Design a protein around this ligand. Structure first.
Ligand SMILES: *[C@@H]1O[C@H](CO)[C@@H](O)[C@H](O)[C@H]1NC(C)=O
Lengths: 49, 49
């Protein structure tokens, strides 16, 4: 809601009915961000000693 | 705010990126350049003849 209408309230008011569309976009990026830390952990942290 | 973002009355354990539900009234400002040209209504209404 910052990238699309941004500071325009009148615009934001008609972005509300999309709703789940913004959720899908946030959810997908969040999943990627988490995976990136998992990848690092799997490669380097072979030994906990 | 987190509960609204996730569309739920219960939130799990973890760190969440939330949406901006904060509102402020803001100001309203209009600016124009100096008006110095005027208009010669003096020669029309203040005519000596
Ligand atoms: C006519 O002269 C008067 C007195 O100086 C002035 O107040 C008025 O604005 C003038 N009229 C116009 C159209 O400029």
């Amino acid at each position: 809601t910052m990238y699309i209408c941004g500071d325009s309230t009148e615009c934001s008011n008609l972005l509300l009915q999309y709703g789940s569309f913004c959720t899908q976009l946030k959810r997908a990026l969040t999943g990627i961000a988490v995976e990136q830390d998992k990848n690092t952990q799997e490669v380097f942290a072979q030994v906990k000693q | 705010e987190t509960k609204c973002t996730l569309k739920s009355f219960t939130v799990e354990k973890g760190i969440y990126q939330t949406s901006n539900f904060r509102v402020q009234p803001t100001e309203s400002i209009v600016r124009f350049p100096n008006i110095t040209n005027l208009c010669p209504f003096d020669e029309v209404f203040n005519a000596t003849r």
